[PDB]
């Protein structure tokens, strides 16, 4: 069972052009993610999938592996499908190129889950959050069953707190592990009404009846999407030394 980690690292960003190359305590952001990905046990290869020559050269400069992909992909999932054709593996793990504080252990929990159940098509992560945090539309909530399979993902606070003291909330952490057959069939899946309304791509999988198991980990570090988050992560990564 061969697993590979793919890190989508597009150059562009509306608030932070050249995001993967931003310096964080002496190294470009993409290098931090790449180095942590290399510490994950059970992975055969780690690839940075980018759309810009500048990111590709930067990755090669530090000794990493990069693969050029199309600039017209709107989702990191479609970018992963392009890579699956070139890089053969049984399990593909998709890590965000803008989460330099990723814990290697969390990715191993995800991979273990896929290996423990060969019938599992997709796996992802989640962590507990307060009711106050669950009220925010920018935080994606997930509700799961006894086997930890996701019932639904939403920007609405679910479960609804009719009996507030009984509600427990989970935030979805956007890291995914996919079995190869899922990616081979991906392009044939139609967009779903819930996907379009919520603006959540993972709902395309659920619309088709593809199971997504969600493993719980401890609260994770923030991603870097705004210049404000960038300063926060820099300060956090600095004291972590």
Site map 172..201 versus a copy of itself, x via CB under 8 A: --------------------xxx-xxxx--
Structure tokens at 198: 């919520």
Beta strands at 3-8 and 45-50: parallel, antiparallel or unpaired: parallel
**How many C-beta atoms lie closer than 10 Å to residue 184's C-beta?**
13
Interaction with a copy of itself in 200-239: which residues (CB under 8 A)?
Answer: 203, 206-209
Task: State the nearest-atom distance from the C-beta of 161 to a copy of itself, in Å.
Answer: 6
Task: State the nearest-atom distance from the C-beta of 190 to a copy of itself, in Å.
Answer: 8
Q: 37 vs 205, which CB is nearer to a copy of itself?
A: 205
**How many C-beta atoms lie closer than 10 Å to residue 151's C-beta?**
13
Beta strands at 169-179 and 91-94: parallel, antiparallel or unpaired: antiparallel
User: If you count them, how many residues does the chain have?
Assistant: 241
Q: How far apart are CA 71 and CA 127, in angstroms?
A: 32
Which region among 51-59, 97-105, 145-153, 214-222 touches a copy of itself (by CB under 8 A)? 145-153
Q: Which of these, 74, 66, 71, 72, lies nearest to 6 by C-alpha position?
A: 66
Site map 19..38 versus a copy of itself, x via CB under 8 A: --------------------
Q: 159 vs 221, which CB is nearer to a copy of itself?
A: 159
Task: State the nearest-atom distance from the C-beta of 97 to a copy of itself, in Å.
Answer: 23
Q: 58 vs 203, which CB is nearer to a copy of itself?
A: 203
Q: How far apart are CA 38 and CA 221, in angstroms?
A: 18
> Which residue bears the tokens 């890579």?
83
Q: 20 vs 157, which CB is nearer to a copy of itself?
A: 157
SS3 per-residue string spanning 60-87: HHCCCCEEECCCCCCCHHHHHHHHHHHC
Contact with a copy of itself (CB under 8 A): which of 119, 132, 164, 219?
164
Contact with a copy of itself (CB under 8 A): which of 14, 130, 146, 188?
146
Which region among 58-66, 88-96, 138-146, 176-184 touches a copy of itself (by CB under 8 A)? 138-146
**How many C-beta atoms lie closer than 10 Å to residue 91's C-beta?**
22
**Number of residues this chain uses to bind a copy of itself (CB under 8 A):** 34
Q: How far apart are CA 207 and CA 189, in angstroms?
A: 9
Residues that bind a copy of itself (CB under 8 A): 137, 143, 145-147, 149, 151-152, 154-164, 166-168, 192-194, 196-199, 203, 206-209
């Amino acid at each position: 069972s061969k697993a590979v980690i793919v890190i989508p690292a597009r150059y562009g960003s509306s608030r932070l052009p050249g995001k993967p190359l931003l310096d964080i305590v002496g190294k470009p952001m993409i290098q931090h993610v790449y180095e942590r990905a290399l510490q994950v046990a059970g992975v055969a290869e780690v690839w940075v999938a980018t759309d810009d020559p500048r990111v590709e050269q930067a990755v090669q400069a530090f000794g990493g592996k990069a693969i050029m992909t199309r600039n017209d992909h709107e989702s990191g999932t479609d970018r992963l499908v392009e890579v699956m054709h070139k890089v053969e593996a049984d399990i593909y793990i998709n890590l965000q190129g803008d989460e330099p504080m990723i814990r290697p252990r969390d990715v191993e929990t995800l991979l273990q889950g896929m290996r423990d159940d060969p019938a599992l098509p997709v796996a992802t992560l989640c962590h507990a959050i307060s009711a106050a945090e669950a009220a925010e539309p920018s935080t994606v909530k997930v509700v799961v069953n006894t086997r930890q399979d996701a019932l639904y993902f939403s920007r609405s606070p679910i479960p609804y707190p009719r009996n507030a003291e009984k509600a427990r909330y989970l935030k979805h952490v956007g890291i995914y592990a996919y079995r190869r057959d899922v990616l081979q069939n991906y392009s044939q899946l139609p967009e779903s009404m819930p996907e379009q309304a919520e603006s959540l791509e993972q709902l395309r999988l659920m619309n088709a009846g593809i199971n997504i198991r969600t493993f719980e980990v401890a609260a994770t570090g923030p991603g870097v999407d705004t210049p404000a988050c960038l300063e926060k992560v820099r300060a956090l990564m600095a004291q972590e030394l």
